[PDB]
């Protein structure tokens, strides 16, 4: 149907959207702190405490299967990631304080990127 068509069309742009914004938002990350996931190998306790890891491959997958449907969904994974940083490590450290950083930045990336959405449709 032509209906259904639109839809996959509009769904493409948000994902077109959403690359944009996750490449402004890993550029707020020089230091590729949050670029790939945790090592469980490596914080072997890492999975005790953290029930839901996020980080920007994790995203970047979830993305290019267009399983974003929406800017809340995206959202939510890179709260993920900023909090669950925020919760594991000290806030004496490089960790936590990148997350706050992170944050922030992000956050006025994220706020352009509702305008733009809301205003395409
Ligand atoms: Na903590």
Same mark, same amino acid.
């Given at each position: 149907?032509? &209906? #259904?068509?639109?839809?996959? $069309? +509009?769904?493409? &742009?948000?994902?077109?959207? $959403?690359?944009?914004?996750?490449?402004?938002?890993?550029?707020?990350?020089?230091?590729?702190? *949050?670029?790939? /996931?945790?090592?469980?190998?490596?914080? /072997?306790?890492? $999975?005790? !405490?953290?029930? !839901?890891?996020?980080? *920007?491959?994790?995203?970047?997958? +979830?993305?290019?299967?267009?399983?974003?449907?929406?800017? !809340?969904?995206?959202? &939510?994974? *890179?709260? $993920?990631?900023?909090?669950?940083?925020?919760?594991?490590?000290?806030?004496?450290?490089?960790?936590?304080?990148?997350?706050?950083?992170?944050?922030?930045?992000?956050?006025?990336?994220? +706020? #352009?990127?509702?305008? &733009?959405?809301?205003?395409?449709?």
């Amino acid at each position: 149907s032509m &209906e #259904q068509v639109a839809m996959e $069309l +509009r769904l493409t &742009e948000l994902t077109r959207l $959403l690359r944009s914004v996750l490449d402004q938002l890993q550029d707020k990350d020089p230091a590729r702190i *949050f670029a790939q /996931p945790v090592s469980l190998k490596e914080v /072997p306790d890492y $999975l005790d !405490h953290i029930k !839901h890891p996020m980080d *920007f491959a994790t995203m970047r997958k +979830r993305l290019e299967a267009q399983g974003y449907k929406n800017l !809340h969904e995206f959202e &939510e994974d *890179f709260d $993920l990631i900023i909090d669950n940083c925020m919760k594991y490590n000290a806030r004496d450290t490089v960790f936590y304080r990148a997350a706050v950083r992170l944050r922030d930045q992000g956050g006025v990336v994220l +706020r #352009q990127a509702r305008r &733009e959405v809301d205003s395409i449709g």
